[PDB]
């Protein structure tokens, strides 16, 4: 196509005791008036938890702007390790470049630092760029 669109939106603990193949893990959680923490439960695939030293584990991407915005870009070209968001961006930009769509504009909802961190992965323009994240990426043909 001559122009594509992509939309992004992504949302992203301390101590998790893990027991009993699934995980019945229990941990303190915070509610009420800044003090009282009711200890809640949940669950978690072994892939979703990280070990660290009894047996107590904790939660293992890291940054949420690129989570979403990466889902924006990659949601555009009809396409759809973890420890580096930057890489997975240069990965997404690799696919799109390898299809011909030059990134159009990208909106973002230390700002200068963050943009320059993106422009390094996209090689785009500073004057193009500007916890929860919703992000949008526009693709243009070159």
């Amino acid at each position: 196509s001559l122009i594509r669109i992509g939309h992004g939106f992504d949302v992203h603990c301390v101590t998790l005791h893990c027991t009993n193949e699934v995980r019945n893990c229990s941990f303190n959680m915070t509610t009420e008036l800044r003090d009282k923490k009711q200890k809640v439960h949940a669950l978690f695939y072994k892939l979703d938890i990280v070990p660290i030293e009894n047996s107590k584990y904790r939660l293992i991407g890291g940054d949420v702007a690129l989570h979403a915005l990466t889902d924006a870009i990659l949601g555009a070209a009809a396409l759809g390790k973890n420890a580096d968001s930057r890489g997975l961006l240069r990965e997404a930009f690799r696919q799109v470049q390898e299809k011909g769509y030059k990134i159009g504009n990208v909106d973002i909802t230390h700002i200068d630092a963050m943009r320059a961190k993106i422009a390094e992965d996209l090689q785009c323009d500073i004057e193009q760029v500007n916890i929860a994240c919703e992000a949008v990426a526009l693709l243009i043909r070159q």
Partner: antibody, heavy 133, light 109 residues
């Protein structure tokens, strides 16, 4: 509703071992700490041990450090006291007792349901242990 | 190891009177980290007080306690018949947690 049933009593020689069990009912067992208290002949209450909800934090009276080991089984809702290297002076009635259902860290934050053993609001009817040769 | 010394070792009182207990601590407890128990011969002990004077479950307002530093007292405003028994203080400011040696309240004749 709330009750605590001890078991495992009997006569053992000095140097022997013995295992006590305490079954709790009528409340959410997993949330509470537990402790053990004994009374020797003609003595008062003496603090022996305590452990928190998952047995991860266990500590002991100075006079019992080393010889006594506390454990718990949250899977089957049992708490245990493994008593090794028993001596005559340890002869006493042993009471199982329920601790608190909250605790407080060095930051003043209160943790509901993560019980510990500061004090005991529920006490078993007690099981006699006699250590003599 | 915290050593607790109570007084008097036992009390001779009569129904309707007020009883005042005493427990001396060797080192400084934070007033709110003190408990008191009641024990009659032939029955399991029952918790009366935690948190210094927060009433334990089932404990009537007739019982009150307090103190600070190295001396703490319990006061029973008006003794009744069921109240004649042995009473123990307990500190949980520093491990090992320790009990006082008990003070007995008996029937005066």
């Amino acid at each position: 509703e709330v009750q605590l049933v001890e078991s495992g009593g009997g006569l053992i020689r000095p140097g022997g071992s013995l295992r006590l069990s305490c079954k709790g009912s009528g409340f959410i067992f997993e949330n509470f700490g537990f402790g053990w208290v004994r009374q020797g002949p003609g003595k008062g209450l003496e603090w022996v041990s305590g452990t928190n909800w998952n047995g991860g934090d266990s500590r002991y009276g100075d006079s019992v450090k080393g010889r006594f080991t506390i454990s718990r089984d949250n899977s089957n809702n049992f708490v245990y006291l493994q008593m090794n290297s028993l001596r005559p002076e340890d002869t006493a009635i042993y009471y199982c007792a329920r601790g608190t259902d909250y605790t407080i860290d060095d930051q003043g934050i209160r943790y509901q349901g993560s019980g510990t053993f500061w004090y005991f609001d529920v006490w078993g009817r007690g099981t006699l242990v006699t250590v003599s040769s | 190891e915290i050593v607790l010394t109570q007084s008097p070792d036992t009390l001779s009182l009569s129904p309707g009177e007020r009883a005042t207990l005493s427990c001396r601590a060797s080192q400084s407890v934070h007033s709110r980290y003190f408990a008191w128990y009641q024990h009659k011969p032939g029955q399991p002990p029952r918790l009366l007080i935690y948190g210094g004077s927060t009433r334990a479950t089932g404990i009537p307002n007739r019982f009150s306690a307090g103190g600070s530093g190295t001396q703490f007292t319990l006061t029973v405003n008006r003794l009744e018949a069921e109240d004649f028994a042995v009473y123990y203080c307990q500190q949980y400011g520093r491990s090992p947690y320790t009990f006082g040696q008990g003070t007995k309240v008996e029937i005066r004749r």
